[PDB]
Design a binder for this molecule. Structure first.
Ligand SMILES: [Mg+2]
Ligand SMILES: [Mg+2]
Ligand SMILES: [Mg+2]
Lengths: 443, 443, 443
């Protein structure tokens, strides 16, 4: 069932014999952070909160120990889908507060909550259903992750059929055991690549589920002898893993994108919402694609979009509008990848759309043709822009964007840039083996 | 029992505790496609259908994603013959509908349904009992498929007798547990080659069983440590694997082919039906033999037929009439191989045969001699044509065939040719190791 | 249940079927010493005590065997958290007495008891909750300790997720089973590094728990196939393992340090307590860092402090004041490492702190800036002294320290210096492989 109060949470712990409670939160860069709490400490923790080292939320660029207090949220209580012989295990979330009592503005979760409040000021609320894609590789003799494939299936194929089939089934059952309400799971285009579609639900709950989904799948694969990876592009020559984000806005319990009186069955607000996204998508591209590997996926010749356009029938467009209408009307953004931070990505995605609605930004004419087949002169004539080519270019765009700074806050903005800046500098000075193969003998 | 209504399907799921439902459909090229659905979603799925990416139907030549709705068919519900510890697993089939509500004409299942409807206009219904042949190889240390033999048995031999014998028995029991009602199963001519025969049934039901049969057998072999292969010719110097198709036309509940008054006990319609098949078999040979490897099997010196002829006693003929009469009267076509798409293959066989009946096509005199033992002058004198030698030749014949395009529809016709054309072009530019062993030292 | 009397201890042994009783005590250098006693001998042991070779408390510098008598303390009875098929196992502590009946002054436990008694003269009592950090490596094929990492996680990371995850959970449950009342356990900065926090309690009980904690964790890791190491710096280029000590003084049941009137909410006594610690921390640094490897951790550029300073907001200082106030007011000293002797380390902390209170030593102005970023002239101008660079320097300081000698007693003082002196002399004459790599080719 659903737990609401701390009394209900305590009753469930005693009833089902939960021995350990694990907090859950993410840092600025999207890594999942957690620590364990004995079951007996839970009652005291609900009363006064737990002190911890809040400097862990500032990424790996932390310098000084700082103390903030975490106040648990009973509504987020859930039980992990594995049963150790010792006892049951459960997880819980909460809010971060400074010692003086003010909420800590560096928390990515707090960033999303502020965005929700801004949307609520205009009466709107967002529902997001993401589609997460991941790989399933083998493990070496020492248990370290590898890139060995498990099958050579294709799109929607009925694979695998060996022992790896049971591992895939176990992941589906474990997610359903927690009430995830999976829509559909299927094979993806690349070999040993799978996709899972989440139920179309509230944005705040979805973001927490996405974080929970990541380490649940990874834990299951280890105990079955496999490894699940979320790299945006682990192999060259095959499709990468992306996280498309279907979204919709609801006012007064009704979808606002649907308009029965328009030829495209789309409301005027939906046009503005797309217009806002297109205008600002270049600026916060770093948030949606936070690692260097993310831009190996964003290359022409695959399903990944590298051009800024919106369409109804075309699929290569950055923003795709599914043919579904009515209450199910939705807008799909195809840029993000699973390595992104769901809290930051959704918050910017919401904030960008609202700014377009507020300012009535015209999205322009849709692109129903194949952009990849057009020439540069055609693209220049049509005024079609392109996403940043590499991480360094994305940082330069995001670094002068005042809209991103205003939305994310000063603290998160500065910390995110410095962490990415140091990461890029380390990468740019490495001599890759590809250079040796091409240049050692020629020169 | 047999489930006919969605209420019965739901009751069976609750009764037998089925946790996952898998859809089932095939693309244009014959690959089996599927995706999973949680048991809770089943009730909603029956009411409204499931939206999915239908670009997977168009093969691996897909370019743009297109959305259309699948409506489940409760009459096709069945439970897979393996019991995971989590719960039971079941599969289901359905029809593909475009968003506007019109059925999708690119579905291979829809192609067969149109052919059945065309026969219904003339008052005929067809029953098909196919003979499927496959190999049983060993797996390497990494679980990848190999071509290692399991026994050196011969035709109808009592082999294997080692632990592989239990694996073969499990396949037979699992198929019977699903209600396929197998007729017989025996060893084949080549080592480690086995054959399974099906009972007569409605052509639509038989086609679905053939698709289900393929991945059921493959799954069982993996879990026992072996591999089942359906290549038309996996080894050189031994017989290949083919899928003969015994077929009969039923009108008013009685067999059309049977005729007690004729000396051969075959009706005039059966003569026309054979004549129609012989006239057009050359055109759609690519459908019955879709892959390149299929033509390594159609070479003289084995049971595979390579000349267009029909006979009552000879076995080398392309079309053979078994000695059985009465309701068991049937016509066997020996060209197809298990790699073919059963929906497309049967639809063309039915449509081609009906055209002969309408046009009173005379099949000509049967060939009761050994065609292989004859000379080219004799074959030229007798006017005996031959099947296409390679995949490229078959495509050229199919491409200009007006009848084939009309039967398969424009969408399937164009897509099928392009996929095969690209496949052949890749193959023709490879340097095989056989050339090196022959020409490196010589030249 | 809390065992108090020998009758209660005997009743518990019979009830829970404990077959073996293990004594527990430590030598001067911090090694854990123990010997087994049959359950039947327990009743006789309580009446008269156990005679044993008392030369084991002097370390590895023992020369002549001497006899002292151990008088068991029933209040320290505990049952170890593993269940052999033979029967339960329990541990117990006690005091060491010379044959003439006088207590042995060489016992590290007796040193702490004298320190507690000295504080009792002024009505003060201490509560200490330490934070112990340790590594978790893999065993080789022969079961010998090695240094292969089990995960590449970071600070507060939700790692490991493979089988090592269960091993970590077992440690947490086993500790809770004995009644340790753990606050929180989490991953640390270095890969495969973990931290466990204790609750506040009387310093005598806490010291015994720390000794018990060390071999309990080590035993669990072996039986699961891993190894837990307490080396202050097992790897180069990563953070070391330290044991921070949070301490507080209580008078009349109230916290002495807390003072609501002061702007910093710290009493005048707390300032003197810090002042005493800073004055004498240089002298007994060898006790807190007893092994040679401890000074590899004490290098600039990591979390380890190397400068004598105290701060409230800056956290790189040697002494840190957490933001908590009220009864939770505490002072954290960050120099010690897990290799230190808890009895000697805590005893010297009390003696140094009280001496500051008696003499009203002013702690000086806090350092709120980054000391590592300052220049040598700046630190010289600020008068920021430094901890000893290596074990030899620390011994020289500790050896002329009048305060340390009278605090630890003559017997412990002389024995500790000789043991460390011999250890350093052996190390200073070794030719390390690093020297060969740098100097063989160059010279
Ligand atoms: Mg996808
Ligand atoms: Mg046969
Ligand atoms: Mg720490």
């Amino acid at each position: 069932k659903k737990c609401t109060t701390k009394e209900d949470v305590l009753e469930a712990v005693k009833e089902r014999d939960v021995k350990f409670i694990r907090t859950q939160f993410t840092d600025t860069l999207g890594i999942i952070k957690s620590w364990a709490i004995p079951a007996e400490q839970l009652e005291e923790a609900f009363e006064n909160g737990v002190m911890f080292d809040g400097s862990s939320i500032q990424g790996f660029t932390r310098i000084e120990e700082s103390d903030m207090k975490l106040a648990l949220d009973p509504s987020t209580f859930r039980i992990l889908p594995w049963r150790p012989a010792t006892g049951a295990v459960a997880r819980i979330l909460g809010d971060v507060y400074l010692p003086d009592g003010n909420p800590f503005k560096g928390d990515p979760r707090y960033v999303l909550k502020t965005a929700i409040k801004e949307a609520e000021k205009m009466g709107f609320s967002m529902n997001v259903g993401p589609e997460l894609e991941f790989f399933l590789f083998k493990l070496d003799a020492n248990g370290n992750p590898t890139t060995e494939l498990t099958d050579q299936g294709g799109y929607f194929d009925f694979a695998p059929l060996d022992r790896a089939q049971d591992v895939r089934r176990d992941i589906d059952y474990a997610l359903e055991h927690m009430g995830f309400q999976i829509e559909a799971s299927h094979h993806e285009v690349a070999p040993s690549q799978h996709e899972i579609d989440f139920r179309f639900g509230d944005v705040l709950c979805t973001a927490d589920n996405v974080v929970t989904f990541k380490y649940v799948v990874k834990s299951i694969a280890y105990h079955k002898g496999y490894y699940a990876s979320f790299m945006p592009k682990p192999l060259f020559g095959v499709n990468g893993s992306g996280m498309h984000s279907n979204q919709s806005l609801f006012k007064d319990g009704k979808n606002v994108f649907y308009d029965p009186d328009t030829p495209t069955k789309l409301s005027q607000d939906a046009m503005y919402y797309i217009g806002g996204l297109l205008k600002h998508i270049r600026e916060f591209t770093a948030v949606t694609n936070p690692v260097v590997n993310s831009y190996k996926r964003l290359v022409p010749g695959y399903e990944a979009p590298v051009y800024i356009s919106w369409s109804a029938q075309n699929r290569s467009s950055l923003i795709r509008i599914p043919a579904t209408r009515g209450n199910g009307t939705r807008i799909e953004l195809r840029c993000p990848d699973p390595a992104c931070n769901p809290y930051l990505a959704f918050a910017l995605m919401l904030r960008a759309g609202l700014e377009g609605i507020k300012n009535k930004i015209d999205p322009g004419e849709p692109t129903n043709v194949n952009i990849f087949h057009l020439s540069d002169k055609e693209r220049e004539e049509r005024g079609i822009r392109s996403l940043p080519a590499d991480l360094k270019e994305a940082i330069d765009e995001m670094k002068g964007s005042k809209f991103v700074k205003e939305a994310l806050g000063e603290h998160v903005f500065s910390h995110y840039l410095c962490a990415k800046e140091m990461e890029w500098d380390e990468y740019k000075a490495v001599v890759h083996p590809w250079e040796l193969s091409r240049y050692l003998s020629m020169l």
